[PDB]
């Protein structure tokens, strides 16, 4: 009865096992964007992914996972809030069943298709495993999904999801550029907050851009094939692996841009 995304293990049940998801600073929340201040002190975000090196894509049973090599500083993202050099680790999405649901964060409660995390962590803490244990240890690019045009640099991501349908399925996933799946635009939201699945660390330092990208209904309907199950047990589609918006409390989210 591990946790998952169903009425019987969902986020509503995870406090149980994972008591910090009632914590002071959990993920996703709310970006009301009237109340987010212009903070004319934060640096230009530095997304540097040219040497970006893709290894491997993972279905683990919550998502699917496209890891890079990060053995060495290879693919950073530096300024914005953050103090020295985060290495990019893995990107995965969140998800819906419908195109009106599936982001994690919302802007003033509107809820997008879905949500890319770029998962970067913390150079200083030598390894991801010490990163996250810090409450500056890991800093996620969270990017907006809205349905209209395709996006030609997601493709190549969509169609090895066929071999990676189950739970515990991975691929060879060489030389995939995650420029391809950026917006024009850097403007951002930046707060403090957590990892959105369980274990639920504090360890997030979030920046949310303001400017989603554009995916075709035929891309998003590809995730939505995706299995949460094993190879040979009942089929439960991969849809709707979201966190809800969680409370604020005692923070404060700042703004890159007037
Ligand atoms: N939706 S998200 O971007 O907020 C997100 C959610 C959950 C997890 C991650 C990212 C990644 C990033 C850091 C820890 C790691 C992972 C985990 C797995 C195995 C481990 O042994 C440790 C950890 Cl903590 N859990
Ligand atoms: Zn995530």
Redesign the pocket.
Known sequence: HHWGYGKHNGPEHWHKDFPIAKGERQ?PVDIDTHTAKYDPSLKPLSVSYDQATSLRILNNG??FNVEFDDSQDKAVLKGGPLDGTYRL??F?F?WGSLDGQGS?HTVDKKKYAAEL?L?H?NTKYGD??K??QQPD??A?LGIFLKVGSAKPGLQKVVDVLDSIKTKGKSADFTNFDPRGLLPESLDYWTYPG??????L?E??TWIVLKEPISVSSEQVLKFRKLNFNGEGEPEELMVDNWRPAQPLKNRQIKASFK
């Open positions: 993920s919550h998502a680790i893995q995965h969140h994690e995390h998962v962590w991801f495993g990163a996250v240890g890991l996620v957590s990892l959105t699945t369980p274990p660390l360890c997030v």
